[PDB]
C-alpha cells in the first residue's frame, strides 16, 4: 500500500525559508509524479508544483515561480518542498501527493495518495502558552458557560471538559488570529441551570507547543 | 490560467437524496483531465474521480463523474450520512493545474433561531490589563448570521472577530462566537455593552446586553 509520510510542523519567521520532506513507501518511486498542495486555514486547495524524479522534471505554479523548489532523493524515496520568502500569507497545511496508478500500471495524473499534512506557521510571534479565563454562567432552564483560551502561539490547542466526561453540548470554536499575532479561542458548553450549584465544570486546555496544560474551574458569577 | 468555478457554494440535502455538484472551467479542459476530491474536517483530500469519469479504487459505486469541455459534474446517486463533506474539482489538462473553490454538502433541517448569550470580561482578565466581551450564538440554522456590537449604544467596528463551528453531526446546527476586544481603560470608560443578533430564524433582532459592574 502506497504511504506518504511528511516531516513535522514548522515555525518560521517572515523572509526565512522552509523545507518539508515526504517519504514514499509501498511502491515504485521514480516513474510517478509527486506534487505539493497547500491549504490555508479554512480555505481552498492550492497546487504548488510537482516533480517526476526519474527525469528530474519539475513544474511550478506561476504565482510561486522562483520561491518554490521541489527535489527528490531516489535512494531514500523522498521528495522535498523548499519555499523561500515566507510571509504570513504562506501559513498553511502543506500536503505531498502522488498520482494514482491504473490498470496496466498506467499513471493516472490525478492525486490518489496523500501525505498526512505539515503545518507551516510564518510569524514574528514567539511560542507562548494560553491564558485561560472563565466565561461564567449568567447570574440569571439552560445555562451557557465556557473558557476563553487567549494569546497562545502557534496552533494547535485542545480543550476538553471535566477530563473528557462532559461532551454533550460542548462547542469548541476555531481559533482566530488576532492582530497581535497571537491566537484566541473559546470553548463553551450548555448545561442545566439547576446543576450550577451542585456540579463542577472544569475546562482542560493543552497547548503542546509550549507544553502548557491548564485546568480552569468555571464558577457562577458573584459579587 | 483555467479558473474552475464550483456551484452551488453550499448544498443542503438529506441521506437518500441524489446530489449533483458542478464544476465549470473558464476554458476547455484538455482531454477530460478533471478530478474530484472529498475532504472532511481535519483530513487530507481523498480522490473520488479521475479523468472526468474514472472511479478511484475503493470509492463506492454511488459516486460518478461526468461532463466535457468546460462543464463537469459529480453525482452521488443516493447520499449516506458520511457523504456530507467538502468536494473539490481539479483540472490537470495543462501544466498549470488549478482547483475549484469547493462545494460543501450540509444536512438540511428546519430553520432554528440562535440562543444568544453575552459574557462580560472576567475580573481575572481585567486584572491583566485587557478586556474581551464574548457573544455566543448557539445551535442555529442556516449558517448565515450577523452580530453587531454596541458600546454605550454606539456601533462598534473593526474590533471584533468571530468564528463558527462545523455543522453539528446530530442536530445539523451551527454555533458562532464573537469576541469584542478593548483595552481595560476603554472598557472601564463605558457602561452598556450589547451584542445585537440578526438571523433568518428571528422575527426581530435579539439584543443581549449588560451594564459594566452589575
Amino acid at each position: 500500500k502506497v504511504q506518504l509520510v511528511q516531516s513535522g510542523a514548522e515555525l518560521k519567521k517572515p523572509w526565512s525559508s522552509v523545507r518539508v520532506s515526504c517519504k514514499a513507501s509501498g511502491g515504485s518511486f521514480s516513474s510517478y509524479a509527486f506534487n505539493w498542495v497547500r491549504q490555508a486555514p479554512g480555505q481552498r486547495l492550492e497546487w504548488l508544483g510537482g516533480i517526476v524524479p526519474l527525469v528530474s522534471s519539475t513544474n511550478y505554479a506561476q504565482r510561486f515561480r522562483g520561491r518554490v523548489t521541489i527535489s527528490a532523493d531516489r535512494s531514500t524515496s523522498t521528495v522535498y518542498l523548499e519555499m523561500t520568502g515566507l510571509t504570513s500569507a504562506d501559513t498553511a497545511v502543506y500536503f505531498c501527493a502522488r498520482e494514482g496508478e491504473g490498470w496496466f500500471g498506467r499513471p493516472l495524473r490525478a492525486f490518489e495518495f496523500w501525505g498526512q499534512g505539515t503545518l507551516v506557521t510564518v510569524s514574528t510571534a514567539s511560542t507562548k502558552g494560553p491564558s485561560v479565563f472563565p466565561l461564567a454562567p449568567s447570574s440569571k432552564g439552560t445555562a451557557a458557560l465556557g473558557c476563553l483560551v487567549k494569546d497562545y502561539f502557534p496552533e494547535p490547542v485542545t480543550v476538553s471538559w471535566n477530563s473528557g466526561a462532559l461532551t454533550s453540548g460542548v462547542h469548541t470554536f476555531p481559533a482566530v488570529l488576532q492582530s497581535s499575532g497571537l491566537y484566541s479561542l473559546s470553548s463553551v458548553v450548555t448545561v442545566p441551570s439547576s446543576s450550577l450549584g451542585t456540579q463542577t465544570y472544569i475546562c482542560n486546555v493543552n497547548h503542546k507547543p509550549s507544553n502548557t496544560k491548564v485546568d480552569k474551574k468555571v464558577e457562577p458569577k458573584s459579587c | 490560467e483555467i479558473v474552475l468555478t464550483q456551484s452551488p457554494g453550499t448544498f443542503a440535502l438529506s441521506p437518500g437524496e441524489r446530489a449533483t455538484l458542478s464544476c465549470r472551467a473558464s476554458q476547455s479542459v484538455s482531454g477530460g483531465a478533471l478530478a474530484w476530491y472529498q475532504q472532511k474536517a481535519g483530513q487530507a483530500p481523498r480522490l473520488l474521480i479521475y479523468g472526468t469519469s474514472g472511479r478511484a479504487t475503493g470509492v463506492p459505486g454511488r459516486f460518478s463523474g461526468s461532463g466535457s469541455e468546460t462543464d463537469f459534474s459529480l453525482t452521488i446517486s443516493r447520499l449516506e450520512p458520511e457523504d456530507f463533506a467538502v468536494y473539490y474539482c481539479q483540472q490537470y489538462g495543462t501544466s498549470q493545474s488549478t482547483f475549484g473553490q469547493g462545494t460543501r454538502l450540509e444536512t438540511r433541517r428546519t430553520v432554528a433561531a440562535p440562543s444568544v448569550f453575552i459574557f462580560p470580561p472576567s475580573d481575572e482578565q481585567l486584572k491583566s490589563g485587557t478586556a474581551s466581551v464574548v457573544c455566543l450564538l448557539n445551535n442555529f440554522y442556516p449558517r448565515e448570521a450577523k452580530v453587531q456590537w454596541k458600546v454605550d449604544n454606539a456601533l462598534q467596528s473593526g474590533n471584533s472577530q468571530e468564528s463558527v463551528t462545523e455543522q453539528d453531526s446530530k442536530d445539523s446546527t451551527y454555533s458562532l462566537s464573537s469576541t469584542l476586544t478593548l483595552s481595560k481603560a476603554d472598557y472601564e470608560k463605558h457602561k452598556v455593552y450589547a451584542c445585537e443578533v440578526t438571523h433568518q430564524g428571528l422575527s426581530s433582532p435579539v439584543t443581549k446586553s449588560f451594564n459594566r459592574g452589575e
Binding site: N59, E99, G105, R106, R109 | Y92
Partner: peptide, 16 residues
C-alpha cells in the same frame, strides 16, 4: 502538458 510526462515514460517503456 507536464502532467502527461509519466504516461509517456510508461508508454515508452512498455513500447519496447
Amino acid at each position: 502538458n507536464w502532467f502527461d510526462i509519466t504516461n509517456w515514460l510508461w508508454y515508452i517503456k512498455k513500447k519496447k
